[PDB]
Design a protein around this ligand. Structure first.
Ligand SMILES: CSc1ccccc1CC(=O)N1CC[C@@H]2[C@H](C1)[C@H]2C(N)=O
Ligand SMILES: [Zn+2]
Length: 139
């Protein structure tokens, strides 16, 4: 679990979105595993606007942060899941690193701010859904 709080928006994994997230829906993209809902309180997270390929992510299954190198956002095999079936996540970045399913929602950050959230992985990989292209989150 986990979310990004920026302005009057809450960014979560679409597969973990709650009833309240869907009742206050702003945008969702099944192909990206993202959902953005509106909030009453103002969030103070900063979204990164960059092309960094290195950062640090939080891994709840180890209670640890790990530094990683990750690929640029691209279309990639997501193993047909319970929430979804086979298809290629768009805007997904991969790194070598530990992850388990509840790891989804952990934040990946670079020196510029939030880059994305854990969204795929397995067999020694970890996938992050990029949010740097969502320029509207800042307004
Ligand atoms: C960190 S995910 C993971 C980690 C180790 C082992 C297995 C997984 C896979 C997993 O259970 N997933 C959650 C639901 C859907 C795909 C990934 C998500 C998507 N974005 O399509
Ligand atoms: Zn950066």
């Amino acid at each position: 679990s986990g979310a990004i709080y920026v302005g009057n928006y809450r960014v979560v994994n679409r597969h973990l979105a709650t009833h309240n997230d869907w009742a206050n829906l702003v945008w969702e993209d099944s192909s990206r595993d993202l959902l953005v809902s509106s909030t009453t309180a103002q969030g103070c997270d900063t979204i990164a606007r960059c092309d960094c390929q290195t950062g640090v992510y939080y891994c709840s299954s180890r209670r640890k942060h790990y530094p990683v190198s990750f690929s640029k956002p691209s279309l990639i095999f997501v193993e047909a899941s319970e929430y979804y079936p086979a298809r290629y996540q768009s805007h997904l970045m991969l790194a070598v690193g530990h992850s388990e399913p509840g790891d989804c929602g952990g934040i990946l950050r670079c020196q510029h701010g939030v880059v994305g959230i854990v969204s795929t992985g397995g067999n020694g990989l970890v996938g992050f859904a990029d949010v740097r292209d969502l320029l509207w989150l800042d307004e």
